[PDB]
Design a protein around this ligand. Structure first.
Ligand SMILES: Nc1ncnc2c1ncn2[C@@H]1O[C@H](COP(=O)(O)OP(=O)(O)OP(O)(O)=S)[C@@H](O)[C@H]1O
Length: 893
């Protein structure tokens, strides 16, 4: 018997399953899927659509839960496509002539309902590729009876051919010779060349399945066509249909003469095409792929320094030009020698052309010159140097007044606001920025907001302030600005969303002198309006870098500054291109992989503090990757404000880590199961480790999941401890409890045990709080209902579910039933209860099963996580997740 009713749109599950006590596991998993956007709520029934079905089958977090419903096995099938007529004919039609077994090639006939097959009293499943091919053919058939014609046939069979190539389907004679390609994304092939007097760069657009002769026709035509017809050398014909989003990129590539990049405008397009094109280009050209193409082609935009060499008579002998490479990997510098004024004159002419074009690209003898930070003062200094050479030859913080009277800054928050203000009062001359590296949950947002509002009230006539953060954090920034301050004298503009369109230039209204540079994306003058704080995203910063860098700012805030950890990233280049009086880098983890992250952050905040990247690498990266760390920490100390939750443990509730839970003991059945598992894994390896570690984690947490025998059901020490302490909490304080576990089956087991022993089912939440208001609002409503319920309560969250904009301050007890391999995730999950605004002591439970003769997986995990957290207390230390190599002690016994 199948638990689902098959329909044309997916598998359907009745809502009455929640009312069946014998099907508790299935009902709980259906609730989990509904919470995780896998199920659609219909009239008294859940819907598991075919796309959701395939995504679920590919999901590994629900792999153990799949046997609950029992989806039919995928039947290996290869389709054979037939057709009649040609694309020109309005009666053109493509249908799947037959299906055959992939190895056997035997024709098969089925009875099909949606994606579920029926061969002979046995239901099967269509492959995702075969289902997509069938969907494409049926969509072409449905579209032809509506709008028959050439375009419909071409688009429909382009989709069909893509699906059939993905599904390895066989075409007939005509469809094999016919080719219709509709590019969705574009690839830019960059290769340095020396066509001109100096080096140039060649751009070559590339499709996923570009025809062999498409580029020739693309070059020959004076305009980019919506459609291309390219004869093939094999007697075939190829059609290319260019969507408008791809067409704008192809227009920009085609406007470059000969597809050779020479000059400031073309090199600026190569540096960052998204400012010239817009946000639509990111969907056409992947920014990471563009960065990789720039790296592979050795296209680095160097920073240059002109060092005049002085003679004994204070006269210039020669000028040395040092080009500092920009890349994630430090590279040796490039040094030139100007022994005569005319060489420096040519260099100055190149710089003048690049700055008169108002472009950040530059060029000099086959090397690019990042001119984003090349201010007008540097240009005047270079001109003065050239002229000179030619002539010679020939603290109490200030709280904002608009802060609400019921809001009090903490002592550390007041210290941070005072530190920010004192650093800002010398921001033009002495400092240039700072790194606010406090841990999460210390109210860094409120400190920065207080600093910004104090600046706005104190100096109302200064340029506006820029906040760059992910949208999920931009919403939080606006929310907290409204919550903490009287937002009457602080106008705000949020560039993300349709507000970018409200201030964007019309496509044809861009000024002609800027359209000649290939600039298709621009913001209308006065786009700032009366706003004093402007909220924008890193992606919007990259896309509107040209418009954002055209006016001076006062304070630029980069929240989660680890987004600019890569020196060569386009987002990092956009962030450094923006000219602000003070730049605050805000991240709780300044170093994630290497100290180059810290170098990038401080080059953004205080340029030149750590020197060039090669010097930093040879001085602080290579020696480290210690006294080097203690010197780096004292060099960055004056402009770094690093505070941890242990330093500010008094402006917080009391976090009690219970020790009684960590002394649990393996039962005899659990111990023998673990020993048998380890022995079997070792025997298999003698005749990988991640599977053994997962099995040991499941054995220690709930041995019944590993083995459904009755012995393992009644011999789970961690479950017994959980039930006992939940009873104690219920009968003692009536507090709310958060149980953290990522395993769906373990979540269902814990929910069932809590329901049996306490009469209510804890709500399981595994999804995040991203922009998914169709279900994010439901998850927030569940959280609020749990918090608002009086008295005792239990909720089963997951570490990945918690995050931004989610908190449970009505719960005091945090239980990590299964522990993650990254202490930062555990800390962020515990910081859902342990927070500012938690009025009761926080009891953190780490139930650990230990053995007197065996070092269990949980004991080793606890020790490793303690060591990793102790290391992570250091700001300059990276925090990688644990791996199978870190657990290479269980094999010892
Ligand atoms: N003085 C205060 N009074 C009341 N609540 C506060 C105060 N300061 C901070 N909070 C709250 O403390 C919560 C936790 O701080 P967070 O803002 O989440 O941490 P964070 O340092 O801002 O990290 P971010 O947001 O990624 S920069 C905030 O959501 C505020 O609601």
């Amino acid at each position: 018997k199948n638990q689902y009713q098959v329909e044309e749109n997916g598998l359907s599950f009745p809502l009455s399953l929640v009312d069946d006590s014998q099907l508790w596991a299935l009902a709980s998993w259906l609730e989990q899927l509904a919470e995780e956007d896998y199920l659609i709520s219909l009239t008294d029934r859940w819907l598991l659509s075919w796309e959701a079905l395939y995504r679920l089958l590919e999901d590994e977090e629900h792999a153990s839960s799949l046997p609950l419903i029992g989806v039919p096995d995928i039947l290996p099938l290869r389709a054979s496509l037939s057709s009649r007529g040609a694309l020109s004919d309005s009666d053109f039609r493509v249908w799947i002539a037959e299906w055959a077994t992939f190895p056997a090639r035997k024709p098969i006939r089925f009875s099909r309902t949606g994606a579920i097959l029926t061969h002979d009293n046995q239901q099967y499943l269509l492959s995702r590729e075969n289902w997509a091919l069938l969907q494409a053919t049926e969509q072409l058939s449905a579209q032809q009876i509506q709008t028959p014609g050439e375009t419909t046939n071409q688009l429909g069979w382009a989709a069909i051919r893509k699906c059939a190539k993905l599904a390895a389907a066989k075409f007939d004679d005509y469809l094999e010779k016919t080719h219709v390609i509709k590019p969705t994304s574009l690839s830019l092939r960059l290769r340095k060349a020396t066509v001109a007097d100096t080096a140039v760069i060649e751009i070559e657009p590339h499709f996923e399945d570009q025809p062999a002769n498409w580029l020739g026709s693309f070059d020959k035509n004076l305009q980019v066509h919506d459609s291309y017809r390219i004869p093939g050398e094999n007697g075939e014909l190829s059609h290319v249909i260019i969507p408008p989003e791809v067409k704008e990129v192809l227009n920009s590539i085609h406007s470059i003469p000969g597809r050779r990049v020479a000059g400031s405008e073309a090199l600026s397009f190569v540096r960052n095409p998204y400012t010239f094109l817009g946000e639509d280009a990111a969907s056409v050209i992947a920014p990471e792929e563009h960065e990789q193409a720039l790296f592979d082609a050795r296209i680095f935009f160097h920073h240059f320094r002109l060092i005049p060499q002085l003679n004994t008579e204070n006269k210039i002998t020669e000028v040395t030009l040092i080009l500092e490479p920009v890349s994630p990997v430090p590279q040796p510098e490039i040094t030139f020698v100007f022994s005569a004024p005319w060489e420096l004159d040519k260099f100055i002419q190149q710089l003048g052309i690049s700055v008169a074009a108002q472009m950040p690209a530059g060029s000099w003898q086959g090397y690019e010159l990042e001119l984003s930070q090349f201010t007008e003062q540097q240009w005047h200094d270079c001109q003065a140097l050239l002229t000179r050479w030619q002539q010679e030859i020939e603290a109490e913080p200030e709280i904002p007044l608009s802060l609400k009277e019921h809001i009090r800054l903490k002592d550390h928050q007041r210290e941070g606001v005072a530190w920010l203000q004192q650093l800002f009062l010398r921001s033009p001359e002495e400092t240039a920025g700072c790194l606010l590296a406090d841990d999460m949950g210390l109210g860094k947002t409120l400190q920065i907001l207080s600093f910004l509002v104090w600046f706005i009230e104190k100096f109302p006539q200064e340029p506006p302030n820029l906040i760059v953060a992910p949208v999920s954090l931009l919403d939080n920034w606006e929310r907290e600005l409204n919550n903490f301050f009287y937002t009457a004298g602080i106008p705000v503009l949020k560039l993300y969303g349709e507000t970018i369109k409200a201030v964007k230039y019309p496509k044809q209204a861009i000024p002609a002198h800027l359209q000649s540079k290939g600039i298709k994306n621009l913001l209308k003058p006065g786009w700032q309006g009366e706003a004093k704080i402007i909220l924008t995203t890193y992606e919007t910063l990259r896309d509107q870098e040209f418009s954002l860098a055209r006016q001076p700012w006062s304070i630029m805030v980069c929240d989660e500054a680890q987004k600019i950890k890569n020196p060569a990233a386009l987002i990092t280049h956009a962030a450094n291109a923006v000219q602000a009086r003070f730049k605050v880098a805000c991240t709780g983890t300044p170093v994630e992989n290497t100290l180059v992250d810290l170098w990038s952050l401080f080059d953004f905040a205080q340029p030149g503090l750590l020197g060039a990247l090669n010097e930093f690498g040879k001085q602080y990266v290579r020696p480290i990757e210690t006294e080097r760390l203690e010197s780096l920490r004292a060099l960055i100390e004056p402009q770094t404000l690093r505070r941890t939750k242990e330093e500010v443990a008094r402006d917080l509730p009391q976090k009690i880590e219970v020790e009684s839970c960590k002394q649990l003991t393996l039962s005899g059945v659990q111990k023998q199961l673990y020993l048998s598992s380890v022995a079997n894994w070792q025997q298999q390896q003698a005749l990988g480790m991640l599977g053994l570690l997962h099995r040991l984690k499941l054995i220690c947490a709930h041995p019944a999941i590993v083995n459904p025998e009755p012995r393992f059901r009644d011999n789970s020490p961690k479950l017994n401890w959980l039930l006992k302490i939940l009873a104690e909490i219920k009968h003692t304080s009536k507090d709310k409890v958060i149980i953290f576990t990522e395993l769906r089956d373990l979540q269902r087991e814990l929910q069932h045990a809590i329901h049996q022993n306490f009469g209510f089912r804890p709500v399981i939440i595994n999804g995040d709080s991203s922009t998914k208001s169709q279900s994010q609002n439901s998850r927030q409503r569940l959280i609020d209902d749990f918090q608002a319920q009086p008295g005792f309560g239990v909720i089963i969250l997951s570490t990945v579910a918690v995050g931004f904009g989610v908190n449970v301050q009505k719960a005091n007890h945090v239980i990590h039933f299964t522990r993650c391999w990254n202490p930062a995730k555990e800390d962020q999950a515990t910081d859902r209860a342990y927070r500012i605004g938690q009025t009761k002591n926080v009891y953190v439970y780490y139930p650990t099963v230990r053995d007197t003769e065996i070092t269990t997986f949980e004991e080793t995990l606890d020790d490793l996580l303690q060591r990793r957290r102790a290391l992570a207390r250091d700001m300059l230390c990276a925090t990688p997740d644990l791996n199978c190599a870190d657990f290479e002690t269980i094999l010892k016994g």
